[PDB]
Amino acid sequence: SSIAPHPVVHVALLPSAGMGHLTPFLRLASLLLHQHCHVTLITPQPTVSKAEEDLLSRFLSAFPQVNQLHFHLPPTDPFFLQFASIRSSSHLLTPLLSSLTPPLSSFIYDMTLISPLLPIAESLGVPHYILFTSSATMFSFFSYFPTLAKSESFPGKLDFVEIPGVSVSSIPRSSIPPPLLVPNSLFGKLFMEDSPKLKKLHGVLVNTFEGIEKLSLEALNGGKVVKGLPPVYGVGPFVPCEFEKVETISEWLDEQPSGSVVYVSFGSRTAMGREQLREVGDGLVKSGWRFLWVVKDKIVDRAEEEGLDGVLGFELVERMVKEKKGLVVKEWVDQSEILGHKAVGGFVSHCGWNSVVEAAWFGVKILGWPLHGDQKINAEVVAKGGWGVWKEGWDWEGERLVKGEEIGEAIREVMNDESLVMKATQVKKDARKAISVGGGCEVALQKLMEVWK
Ligand SMILES: O=C(CCc1ccc(O)cc1)c1c(O)cc(O)c([C@@H]2O[C@H](CO)[C@@H](O)[C@H](O)[C@H]2O)c1O
Ligand SMILES: O=c1ccn([C@@H]2O[C@H](COP(=O)(O)OP(=O)(O)O)[C@@H](O)[C@H]2O)c(=O)[nH]1
């Protein structure tokens, strides 16, 4: 008895600094657009890196129906500095969010912004959420932090973190993210201020799935970690999207035998010291395997200033050009196009979380080389599933010099192991189940959409 336009579900999104935060937010935006949502994207500007700038430009051109709200920031690790700048200025956003049309339905923001955005979301009167961009196991640690910090000996006497029922049952002190043991650090301060406020959220979205973190997901939603935690929605794996693409790399890969290439990358914001970097190349040559090595000499891509031949040195460059087995680049690559190529049989990775979930989506086994932060916990999430391995004696980047001899031996050990491929293929199979009807991601998004309507 009526011919009416259907009311629109309008979601607002706010990502913080780095490609490891921007990429999952934009993949979530694509998922929401395919559910016929209207999306507003708040963009803090300028970005720390050029790669962030360029990805946003390709996203907006692909989806002109997205409403961009500019967030011009006022004028240490450059990405951590941006985390603090966005957090300290977020209290100014209220006028831009309260005048949104059509009426806002929900608000999903970065995990590092809980405290300043909670009163803003309360005034908007809509359900609000964090998108947590690391593993569900690390989210359990974050939620558990007030339980550990109440002790009078914290953080001096803490040898094991054992959260009931999660995917990594015992986290030793050597795997705790170093800033969490330093009360005055940025993340140590954010953990203490923000974790007690998790109970005010409507929910927590995580880019993960039952095939890789079954136990952590069940413990978080069973009241085992902390009583009164908001529900945790496993909405991963986030499938890589078309707008991310920017041809000699793909042409080189086309000429290599299937499964014969080892891909090497330590993410978008980490650069090894020059001596350690040169040991990586020595290990790749000694391994005897074909390789595609992505190099960074600076944390921030904008700051690169020396050519690859000067970074690598004459002796290493000469060895690699003579053997004619490897390709080395110091530029932004299409990592998902590489991991999805049939030539790539293994992945030497720092185990940043987006890279882990991409490797799971493509069924590529991992040699884990965790370098900083939560990467040792993520490396063990992978090892528990039997589709990758890591050497706990290598330690955080810069604590010791890992030698080319032992790097080459570790590469041969992973590439000769067919059991790792067997488990990685089953992970790949469970990754597709999660997004199909009845899978964890499909079930979670339907729950959220019905609430927002
Ligand atoms: O516990 C986490 C993640 C959970 C969290 C929760 C609330 C919060 O307020 C901050 C973090 C974490 C850490 O304790 C140290 C650290 O160094 C990184 C690293 O964060 C950088 C960002 O730039 C990534 O690039 C890198 O991959 C990742 O390992 C972390 O994720
Ligand atoms: O040359 C590069 C380097 C990185 N990435 C992507 O950048 C992200 C890195 O995020 P992750 O959580 O793995 O680690 P972080 O870079 O934050 O340490 C992933 O989506 C990678 O696929 C890419 O496409 N090309």
Question: What descriptive keywords fit this protein?
Answer:
6-stranded parallel β-sheet, globular, alpha/beta, Rossmann fold, 7-stranded parallel β-sheet, 15% strand, 18 helices, binds uridine-5'-diphosphate, 2 domains, 453 residues, binds ligand E7F
Total of helices: 18
Structural class: alpha/beta
Number of domains: 2
Bound ligands, each once:
the ligand O=C(CCc1ccc(O)cc1)c1c(O)cc(O)c([C@@H]2O[C@H](CO)[C@@H](O)[C@H](O)[C@H]2O)c1O, uridine-5'-diphosphate
CATH homologous superfamily classification of the largest domain = Glycogen Phosphorylase B
Q: What strand line-up does the widest sheet have?
A: 3-2-1-4-5-8-9
Q: What would the CATH topology of the largest domain be?
A: Rossmann fold
Strand element count: 15
* Content of β-strand: 5-15%
Going by CATH, the architecture of the largest domain would be: 3-Layer(aba) Sandwich
- What would you report as the Rg, rounded to the nearest angstrom? 22 Å
Largest sheet: 7 strands, parallel
